[PDB]
């Protein structure tokens with residue numbers, strides 16, 4: 001047992017490892033979207049930039065959990081990063097819709113993880129998740145939802161082009 | 170009853186006073202370590218600096234709880250500050266090992282205090298402890314644990330000298 | 339067929355996708371090493387920094403190939419990122435030794451890929467690999483080899499500590 | 508024979524002269540497009556700017572080959588610059604489509620020229636073409652392909668106007 005470990009349940013430790021893989025899964029999916037929008041037959045560089053940035057942030061989310069695992073004296077155990085669900089992601093609206101459901105899946109996983117920590121009276125881990133993950137997901141879900149609504153507003157063709165400009169600017 | 174007081178249980182108030190004395194106890198122990206390493210027959214000025222800084226921070230932890238007691242309308246009641254457990258603290262590794270167990274004792278006390286506040290639905294006090302005390306203890310326990318591991322790595326003699334340089338720099 | 343595509347053989351396109359997954363595999367392995375050295379019972383922050391930086395660079399190598407695939411009109415096809423070969427990586431010397439063999443495996447893969455492009459007279463892809471991948475691997479293999487030799491020179495304990503300082507500085 | 512000349516085959520020298528005329532042919536065609544889009548009944552100043560810049564760059568490509576011919580001790584032999592294939596170039600999309608096929612024709616010519624140099628083991632000329640011509644063509648073909656895809660996305664009328672703004676900005 002780690003000389004660090006205190007009030008840290010084995011279930012919370014395993015849930016951290018589960019969340020780490022989920023953050024990496026999201027990172028990989030956003031990276032796929034980024035280079036899908038970089039295809040010559042898609043050519044939406046603002047959408048590409050938005051999902052590239054989303055992918056970098058998910059990588060940061062994963063590493064912060066890796067750091068936290070070690071802080072508490074748990075042990076990082078990594079698993080395969082599953083390839084994304086699709087190879088092509090359709091229109092800008094299609095990809096934002098996928099991104100919304102992905103962010104909500106990550107949020108549900110974090111809420112489940114918070115329930116685990118709370119069930120073991122892990123007050124510090126609960127605050128860590130609230131501060132560094134739960135607030136971010138609410139903001140990210142609202143932001144993408146706004147993108148979806150705007151993308152439906154502007155429609156296909158020129159509208160998608162104009163919104164890509166917004167994401168590039 | 171204080172014109173301030175609201176949702177503040179007498180047990181939470183008494184637990185704050187208990188934590189105050191514990192923070193002061195840690196302050197005094199680190200101060201002892203600081204001037205132990207300043208002995209001419211010990212002569213480890215980086216270890217001295219590290220524990221001097223640790224002592225100043227524990228004094229700050231105590232005062233912030235004193236401030237918080239008044240914010241909530243509780244009343245600060247001070248007790249004797251017990252002299253440290255030892256007069257001499259051995260090697261740099263020995264003192265870090267003591268520091269780890271002290272920090273874990275402070276952390277257990279804070280976790281107990283958090284359970285008291287939570288049992289009385291004192292949501293604000295719980296957040297105060299999480300934000301200003303529980304995160305710090307996890308970081309401090311990890312930092313000292315890293316020091317212990319490095320101090321075992323470098324060994325006695327020149328190794329202890331070199332790590333003292335690191336702490337001085 | 340992509341409106342871009344010219345002098346780009348399907349085998350070269352598939353080899354790019356193979357190299358992409360290999361770069362991501364190396365990225366993941368270095369990330370594992372980074373947080374292994376961040377364990378409280380390992381506590382080698384310079385080694386951690388070196389492999390964190392190595393992981394970021396491998397991620398960049400992957401994305402540049404993703405970009406190149408699209409430039410030529412090929413289509414990025416991603417596969418699972420296999421978890422690293424180990425969960426723990428031993429001493430600093432052990433991890434550098436693993437890193438050397440990983441870099442040589444990546445280099446062999448790139449040399450094979452270069453042979454594929456050259457067999458199809460893909461002069462531009464050959465230059466792209468030479469400029470952005472083959473030179474880097476020779477430099478990276480020499481750098482890690484120097485680390486291994488120095489790590490054997492300094493030995494275990496204090497020596498490993500001192501070399502960690504070098505990597506942190 | 509030039510006092511410079513070394514490992515420079517007469518076929519490579521003649522191929523350089525062929526490429527020079529082709530670069531000048533592209534320069535002239537882009538210049539035509541530039542002033543077509545400057546017509547009062549076309550009035551697309553961003554498209555005009557894009558093709559003006561393309562024309563200047565093709566002129567630079569030609570001169571660098573002229574310089575290279577002399578460096579190797581070959582002799583520049585110029586031929587008529589054939590007038591462009593059309594006098595009017597249609598919509599912005601039409602002109603980008605022509606530009607794509609022109610760039611691919613230049614790229615095929617360069618690949619053929621590279622095969623000539625490589626067949627005579629002219630390693631330096633091969634590197635010169637790879638470094639200064641083959642990479643540029645891949646980037647230029649991808650860029651124009653992205654323009655075509657975006658121009659189809661935005662459609663005629665206002666869409667063409669908006670993309671002209673992008674090219675002007």
Ligand SMILES: [Mg+2]
Nearest residue numbers: 023058061106
């Ligand atoms: Mg995330």
Ligand SMILES: [Mg+2]
Nearest residue numbers: 192227230275
């Ligand atoms: Mg304290």
Ligand SMILES: [Mg+2]
Nearest residue numbers: 361396399444
């Ligand atoms: Mg690489």
Ligand SMILES: [Mg+2]
Nearest residue numbers: 530565568613
């Ligand atoms: Mg040219």
